[PDB]
Amino acid sequence: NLCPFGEVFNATTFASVYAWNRKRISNCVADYSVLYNSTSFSTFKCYGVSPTKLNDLCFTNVYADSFVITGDEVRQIAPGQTGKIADYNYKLPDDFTGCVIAWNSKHIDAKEGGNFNYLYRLFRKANLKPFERDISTEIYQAGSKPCNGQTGLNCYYPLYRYGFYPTDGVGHQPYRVVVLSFELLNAPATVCG
Amino acid sequence: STIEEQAKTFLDKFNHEAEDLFYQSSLASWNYNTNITEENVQNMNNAGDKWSAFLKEQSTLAQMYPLQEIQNLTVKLQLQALQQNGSSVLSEDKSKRLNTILNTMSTIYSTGKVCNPDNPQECLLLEPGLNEIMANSLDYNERLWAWESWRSEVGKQLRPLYEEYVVLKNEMARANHYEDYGDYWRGDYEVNGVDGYDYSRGQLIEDVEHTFEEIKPLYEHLHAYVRAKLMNAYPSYISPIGCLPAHLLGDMWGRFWTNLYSLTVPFGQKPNIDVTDAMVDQAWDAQRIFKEAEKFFVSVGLPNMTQGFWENSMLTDPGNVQKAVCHPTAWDLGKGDFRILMCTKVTMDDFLTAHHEMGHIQYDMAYAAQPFLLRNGANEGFHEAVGEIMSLSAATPKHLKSIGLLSPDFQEDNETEINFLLKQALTIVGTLPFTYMLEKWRWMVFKGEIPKDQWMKKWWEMKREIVGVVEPVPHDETYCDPASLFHVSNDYSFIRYYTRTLYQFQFQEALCQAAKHEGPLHKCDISNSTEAGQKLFNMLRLGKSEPWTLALENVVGAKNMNVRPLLNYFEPLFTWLKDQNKNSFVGWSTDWSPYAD
Ligand SMILES: *[C@@H]1O[C@H](CO)[C@@H](O[C@@H]2O[C@H](CO)[C@@H](O[C@@H]3O[C@H](CO)[C@@H](O)[C@H](O)[C@@H]3O)[C@H](O)[C@H]2NC(C)=O)[C@H](O)[C@H]1NC(C)=O
Ligand SMILES: *[C@@H]1O[C@H](CO)[C@@H](O[C@@H]2O[C@H](CO)[C@@H](O[C@@H]3O[C@H](CO)[C@@H](O)[C@H](O)[C@@H]3O)[C@H](O)[C@H]2NC(C)=O)[C@H](O)[C@H]1NC(C)=O
Ligand SMILES: *[C@@H]1O[C@H](CO)[C@@H](O[C@@H]2O[C@H](CO)[C@@H](O[C@@H]3O[C@H](CO)[C@@H](O)[C@H](O)[C@@H]3O)[C@H](O)[C@H]2NC(C)=O)[C@H](O)[C@H]1NC(C)=O
Ligand SMILES: *[C@@H]1O[C@H](CO)[C@@H](O[C@@H]2O[C@H](CO)[C@@H](O)[C@H](O)[C@H]2NC(C)=O)[C@H](O)[C@H]1NC(C)=O
Numbered sequence: 008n009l010c011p012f013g014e015v016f017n018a019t020t021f022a023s024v025y026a027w028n029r030k031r032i033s034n035c036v037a038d039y040s041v042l043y044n045s046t047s048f049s050t051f052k053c054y055g056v057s058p059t060k061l062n063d064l065c066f067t068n069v070y071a072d073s074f075v076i077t078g079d080e081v082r083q084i085a086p087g088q089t090g091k092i093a094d095y096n097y098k099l100p101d102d103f104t105g106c107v108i109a110w111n112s113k114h115i116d117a118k119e120g121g122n123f124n125y126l127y128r129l130f131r132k133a134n135l136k137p138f139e140r141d142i143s144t145e146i147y148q149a150g151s152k153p154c155n156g157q158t159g160l161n162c163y164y165p166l167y168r169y170g171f172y173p174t175d176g177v178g179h180q181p182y183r184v185v186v187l188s189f190e191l192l193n194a195p196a197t198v199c200g
Numbered sequence: 201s202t203i204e205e206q207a208k209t210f211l212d213k214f215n216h217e218a219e220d221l222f223y224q225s226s227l228a229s230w231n232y233n234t235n236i237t238e239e240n241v242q243n244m245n246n247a248g249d250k251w252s253a254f255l256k257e258q259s260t261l262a263q264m265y266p267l268q269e270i271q272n273l274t275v276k277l278q279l280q281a282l283q284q285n286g287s288s289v290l291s292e293d294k295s296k297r298l299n300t301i302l303n304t305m306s307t308i309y310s311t312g313k314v315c316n317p318d319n320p321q322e323c324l325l326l327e328p329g330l331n332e333i334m335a336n337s338l339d340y341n342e343r344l345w346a347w348e349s350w351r352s353e354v355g356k357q358l359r360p361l362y363e364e365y366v367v368l369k370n371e372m373a374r375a376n377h378y379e380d381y382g383d384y385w386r387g388d389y390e391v392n393g394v395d396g397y398d399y400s401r402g403q404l405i406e407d408v409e410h411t412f413e414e415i416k417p418l419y420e421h422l423h424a425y426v427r428a429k430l431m432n433a434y435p436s437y438i439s440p441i442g443c444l445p446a447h448l449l450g451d452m453w454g455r456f457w458t459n460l461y462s463l464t465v466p467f468g469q470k471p472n473i474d475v476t477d478a479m480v481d482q483a484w485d486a487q488r489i490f491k492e493a494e495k496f497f498v499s500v501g502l503p504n505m506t507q508g509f510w511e512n513s514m515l516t517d518p519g520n521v522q523k524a525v526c527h528p529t530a531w532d533l534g535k536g537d538f539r540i541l542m543c544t545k546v547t548m549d550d551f552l553t554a555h556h557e558m559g560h561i562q563y564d565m566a567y568a569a570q571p572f573l574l575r576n577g578a579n580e581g582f583h584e585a586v587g588e589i590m591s592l593s594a595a596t597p598k599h600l601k602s603i604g605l606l607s608p609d610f611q612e613d614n615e616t617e618i619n620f621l622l623k624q625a626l627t628i629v630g631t632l633p634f635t636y637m638l639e640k641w642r643w644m645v646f647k648g649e650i651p652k653d654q655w656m657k658k659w660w661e662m663k664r665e666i667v668g669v670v671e672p673v674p675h676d677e678t679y680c681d682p683a684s685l686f687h688v689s690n691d692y693s694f695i696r697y698y699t700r701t702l703y704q705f706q707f708q709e710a711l712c713q714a715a716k717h718e719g720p721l722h723k724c725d726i727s728n729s730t731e732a733g734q735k736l737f738n739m740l741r742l743g744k745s746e747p748w749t750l751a752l753e754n755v756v757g758a759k760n761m762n763v764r765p766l767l768n769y770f771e772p773l774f775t776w777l778k779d780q781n782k783n784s785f786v787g788w789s790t791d792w793s794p795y796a797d
């Protein structure tokens with residue numbers, strides 16, 4: 008009765024993929040039937056529990072991960088199918104107990120001049136283990152020669168920026184993603200529907 | 201820590217950096233071509249210079265990776281495209297001078313006007329004035345005036361510019377480890393690295409000549425027939441054994457004999473196949489016309505057009521308030537943005553070309569998941585060949601009947617069939633000697649085999665022998681008739697058109713065999729054939745990842761271009777011509793001239 012608990016879901020702006028955000032949710036009345044006739048979710052599939060039993064279930068701890076990625080890259084947000092997003096930015100555990108949510112923002116995240124406010128990592132030393140972040144601006148240097156100073160010939164700046172225009176194809180229009188994960192613990196907190 | 205891994209990361213950065221830059225340049229150039237203002241042209245040039253500078257930086261970088269040490273064929277191809285020194289191997293001032301004269305030639309061609317001496321107030325440019333004369337006029341003297349005015353005015357200006365263009369372009373290609381600019385061009389067909397599918401640069405000459413030899417007899421008979429029919433149209437002006445006067449061929453140069461159909465129609469009583477009147481009388485929507493092409497492409501297993509296409513494409517003439525470039529173009533802007541720029545009118549010619557351009561877009565839609573430098577046709581001929589097979593299927597009377605613009609009667613006399621095939625030949629085979637000769641002359645000029653003091657001499661010597669066409673008035677070396685064609689004065693290769701004509705009939709035969717078609721090939725409509733659709737998509741998806749020889753084999757079963765598709769398409773017309781010319785001269789004298797002394 009204290010938490011609309013979707014101040015995450017609908018808001019002004021979100022965070023980049025390499026610096027995705029976490030939030031605790033507690034003391035809530037989770038009604039998700041009004042969100043079934045919401046703006047159509049690009050993808051809404053659950054892994055550990057039933058979508059026809061959500062509100063009946065009264066779990067203890069709940070966490071929310073919100074970030075923005077491109078359209079073709081969205082199908083990587085799942086256990087396995089490791090790729091650019093699924094390794095260097097945000098991986099999911101193979102055993103996953105939660106649900107994934109995504110919808111399309113037509114001109115919210117896209118402006119005629121173009122939006123260059125969302126970043127993403129392309130070069131990293133190793134694949135990220137589940138629920139890890141590495142926001143380091145460490146100049147990547149795969150070639151033996153360690154420039155380490157600035158932009159180099161074989162060196163590269165690991166962070167790149169999304170370009171989002173209102174005339175793009177569907178394959179890379181701004182998709183807005185929210186991930187719900189219920190950690191498995193023997194300690195109670197206050198959440199139910 | 202391998203070179204291959206270093207090269208992979210370099211290529212990833214290039215692809216991700218270049219996609220957005222190419223997209224910005226494409227958006228800017230679209231806003232110009234659809235909305236001609238000074239702000240837009242400056243924005244286009246700014247974006248284009250940014251794109252070229254990024255490309256040159258990446259070229260000098262990619263030149264630092266030793267190609268010879270690469271064992272991956274795909275990454276080697278992408279690296280090769282980037283390592284191309286291109287124009288940069290020229291000094292700065294010499295490159296500037298080359299670009300200046302290039303833009304100057306383009307400008308004077310697209311802006312040249314000739315004025316009538318009898319009435320110096322009437323002046324026409326190439327489009328639409330001079331073209332209207334060369335297409336519809338039946339007066340020999342007026343046509344001769346048009347022909348000679350265009351050449352003797354703009355081409356004389358082009359002559360010295362073209363000499364400097366030839367020498368500098370050959371130098372650039374030589375610095376890029378080629379023999380001449382034609383050899384550079386011939387590099388497009390070169391394959392080096394795939395065992396069992398390579399194809400060298402001299403093999404193109406061998407294949408083009410070996411295949412032009414087989415086309416020769418069919419063209420000879422069409423030439424005889426058109427010559428007799430034109431004798432009826434211009435009495436006392438044409439010898440029954442000589443070459444065709446260059447100014448009676450239907451346009452300014454003879455690239456297409458399309459406008460000779462009215463003078464050469466086999467059976468006037470049989471109706472000519474035109475659906476323009478049906479389109480106007482039938483409820484039409486310009487959206488719907490393009491939608492109908494879309495319905496055609498989905499019926500064979502291809503995807504719809506994108507919502508971005510329908511929202512961003514320009515499908516009607518914007519009017520007098522908004523001036524745009526109306527040359528039909530299919531824009532692949534990148535980032536999944538596909539548009540068509542066309543000032544569509546409700547005419548039969550625009551219907552087939554709409555199919556053609558939307559075929560381009562499907563090609564463009566295909567291979568999108570490939571890396572950037574592989575987003576291109578297998579070679580320079582594949583896109584137009586694909587567009588052209590679409591238009592043939594749409595032009596077939598069966599398709600025209602099934603769409604509802606034609607009467608349900610479907611009368612098909614052996615004479616209505618010969619009419620359609622004859623009109624096809626005026627266009628399809630009339631352009632092949634023109635195409636083959638232009639590139640042959642250009643290749644020889646680049647090789648330095650034609651001295652400066654005999655450019656026009658060898659040009660018209662070659663003109664007579666191959667195409668069977670003779671000049672109506674003599675031209676010394678002051679003139680420069682070769683530079684009087686758009687593709688020549690605007691630095692575009694021309695052999696794609698020879699190659700595309702053969703490829704398109706190979707594809708048509710293959711897809712109609714896939715569709716289990718039984719009748720004459722020219723009556724084939726691949727509509728409603730998901731099997732033919734899949735076989736073409738199976739080729740479309742490669743882009744430039746596989747050699748064009750391997751891609752062609754994947755669909756037709758042959759590693760090289762073939763003439764039997766064209767010859768089988770035109771076999772009925774061939775026998776009809778052979779019968780029609782029994783009492784006609786076959787061959788040409790290389791010595792007859794219209795003029796004397
Ligand atoms: C985030 O998104 C929007 C705000 O932009 C909110 O969605 C919608 O809010 C309106 C009221 O402003 C809802 O209308 C209501 O309909 C119900 C019946 O469905 C009725 O009983 C109410 O009296 C009211 O008229 C609309 O249905 C609702 N849509 C959804 C998603 O259900 C949403 O509440 C915002 N939430 C958060 C946490 O930011
Ligand atoms: C030359 O290098 C390219 C890399 O640019 C090689 O292409 C790649 O082939 C591998 C192996 O099939 C692909 O990996 C796979 O990706 C899928 C993605 O769903 C994954 O599920 C598989 O487990 C596997 O990791 C890779 O994506 C692909 N890359 C590209 C850009 O096509 C190519 O094979 C090399 N040439 C030769 C002859 O080996
Ligand atoms: C195109 O179609 C026409 C008919 O639609 C075909 O024409 C016919 O040709 C035959 C010969 O092959 C003609 O037959 C002969 O009749 C004369 C008397 O008129 C007789 O003396 C001969 O011994 C022979 O029996 C027939 O009359 C003629 N019919 C018409 C209506 O013209 C023509 O052959 C077709 N062309 C092709 C290339 O298939
Ligand atoms: C052609 O370019 C002009 C600018 O050079 C575009 O501008 C118009 O002018 C102002 C510019 O802020 C707009 O507010 C108007 O709405 C535009 N006029 C119109 C749409 O008639 C113009 O939009 C461009 N035209 C097209 C078709 O893109």
Ligand SMILES: *[C@@H]1O[C@H](CO)[C@@H](O[C@@H]2O[C@H](CO)[C@@H](O)[C@H](O)[C@H]2NC(C)=O)[C@H](O)[C@H]1NC(C)=O
Pocket residue numbers: 499602727728
């Ligand atoms: C090829 O595809 C077209 C699709 O337009 C088919 O046309 C339809 O044909 C059926 C059967 O005659 C009609 O009931 C529909 O009304 C037609 N739709 C139209 C004209 O839009 C055509 O029949 C197909 N040809 C085949 C399968 O041989």
